[PDB]
Amino acid sequence: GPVPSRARVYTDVNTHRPREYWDYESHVVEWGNQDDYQLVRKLGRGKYSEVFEAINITNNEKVVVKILKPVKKKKIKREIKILENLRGGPNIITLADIVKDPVSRTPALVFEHVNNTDFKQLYQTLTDYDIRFYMYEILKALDYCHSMGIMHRDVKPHNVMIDHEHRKLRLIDWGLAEFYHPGQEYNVRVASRYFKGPELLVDYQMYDYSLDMWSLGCMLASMIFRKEPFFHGHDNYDQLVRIAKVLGTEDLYDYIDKYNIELDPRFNDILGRHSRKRWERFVHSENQHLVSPEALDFLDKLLRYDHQSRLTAREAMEHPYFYTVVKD
Numbered sequence: 652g653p654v655p656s657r658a659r660v661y662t663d664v665n666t667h668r669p670r671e672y673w674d675y676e677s678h679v680v681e682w683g684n685q686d687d688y689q690l691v692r693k694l695g696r697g698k699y700s701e702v703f704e705a706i707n708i709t710n711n712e713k714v715v716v717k718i719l720k721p722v723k724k725k726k727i728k729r730e731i732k733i734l735e736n737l738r739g740g741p742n743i744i745t746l747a748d749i750v751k752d753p754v755s756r757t758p759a760l761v762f763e764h765v766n767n768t769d770f771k772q773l774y775q776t777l778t779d780y781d782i783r784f785y786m787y788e789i790l791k792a793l794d795y796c797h798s799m800g801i802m803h804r805d806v807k808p809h810n811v812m813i814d815h816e817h818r819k820l821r822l823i824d825w826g827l828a829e830f831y832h833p834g835q836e837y838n839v840r841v842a843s844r845y846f847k848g849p850e851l852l853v854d855y856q857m858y859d860y861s862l863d864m865w866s867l868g869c870m871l872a873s874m875i876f877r878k879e880p881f882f883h884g885h886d887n888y889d890q891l892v893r894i895a896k897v898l899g900t901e902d903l904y905d906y907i908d909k910y911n912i913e914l915d916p917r918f919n920d921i922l923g924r925h926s927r928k929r930w931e932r933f934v935h936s937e938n939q940h941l942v943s944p945e946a947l948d949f950l951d952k953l954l955r956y957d958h959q960s961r962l963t964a965r966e967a968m969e970h971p972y973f974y975t976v977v978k979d
């Protein structure tokens with residue numbers, strides 16, 4: 652069978668916690684007053700929720716209300732508990748309240764207001780300096796949640812809300828987040844296609860926080876090379892082929908051989924043989940101002956097949972790429 656794997660950091664954080672911290676299924680939700688909130692405008696709808704601009708009429712402040720679609724009671728308490736555990740953390744969206752919507756008959760999460768502008772709307776027009784700046788802000792959120800025993804599992808531009816005027820960033824949509832427990836096998840049907848790590852694409856279930864670091868790498872590659880998305884697969888199989896055309900097939904086989912994983916035989920007719928490409932191949936006159944030796948080294952250390960070999964969030968924050976960013 653497959654060889655087991657463990658996170659190399661924050662491995663045992665949940666094993667030492669009281670049950671109450673990670674046992675989300677036992678969580679007793681504390682309900683506020685739906686009457687406090689007036690819905691203003693529908694901002695978005697996904698498979699799991701509809702999101703609204705609203706106002707809290709008890710203090711006149713703007714808020715965002717996310718009305719959860721019926722999904723699985725388990726997933727609802729999981730998101731709630733994760734949001735409560737992470738509250739006040741660096742660049743983590745703040746859950747202000749939880750109420751029952753009278754029409755949907757489901758929970759509605761109330762978040763402190765953020766500007767209705769996601770990172771996807773900005774990240775292709777940032778300066779070199781600002782790419783570094785906002786990458787560091789995203790890393791603060793990731794190292795915090797990882798240190799708290801939680802992996803986000805859906806890191807992507809749409810899940811980073813940015814207020815560029817105020818140089819402010821929040822990581823949102825914790826509906827796919829999970830608690831990391833060593834030796835646990837997780838669902839590989841997480842993350843969005845272009846941001847899925849190789850572990851997901853080869854069906855390796857014993858993954859960890861390092862999944863998020865692959866996703867972050869994909870974002871970085873897209874920004875510095877001005878290529879959206881960087882790995883542009885037409886489905887989940889072709890997604891792995893697109894990765895292999897950059898990182899090469901020999902290191903892919905080394906990865907799957909390390910963990911004693913077998914590829915879906917469906918790959919035999921599509922994967923081929925590909926050399927590792929040098930990162931300089933993606934540099935051109937229109938993106939070169941965004942590329943530096945430090946950027947390429949950093950990217951190279953995020954986009955590794957072997958999840959155990961990727962930089963952790965904290966190691967990433969130590970990287971020379973961030974030396975030019977002013978620290979508070």
Ligand SMILES: Cc1cc(O)c2c(c1)C(=O)c1cc(O)cc(O)c1C2=O
Binds near residue numbers: 695765768812
């Ligand atoms: C179009 C859009 C605008 C937003 O402001 C949010 C979202 C979507 C959103 O999905 C979201 C999810 C979430 O878990 C917390 C949020 O604050 C949010 C949001 O704030």
Ligand SMILES: [Cl-]
Binds near residue numbers: 838
């Ligand atoms: Cl899941």
Ligand SMILES: [Cl-]
Binds near residue numbers: 794860965
């Ligand atoms: Cl980490």
